[PDB]
């Protein structure tokens, strides 16, 4: 769901950090 | 589904700048 989470509505840098290693 | 295709190109780029030295794995799913 990265895509469903971020392509349907905008993601913040901060939600983005969660897909980091 | 060139649309998700367009979108993940920009997402991996935001991820590259956000994860920095840590990396990230990019799954087009789950
Ligand atoms: C930073 C960024 C890139 C592409 C899509 C988004 O929801 C967010």
UniProtKB/Swiss-Prot annotation, chain A:
On the tree of life, the source organism's domain of life is Eukaryota
Question: Covered residues of the complete protein?
Answer: 88 to 108 of 108
Cystine crosslinks: 6-11
Protein's organism: Sus scrofa (Pig)
Would you tell me the protein name for this molecule? Insulin A chain
Give coiled-coil spans as residue ranges: none
UniProtKB/Swiss-Prot annotation, chain B:
Domain of life from the UniProt record: Eukaryota
Protein name as annotated = Insulin B chain
Residue window of the full protein shown: 25 to 54 of 108
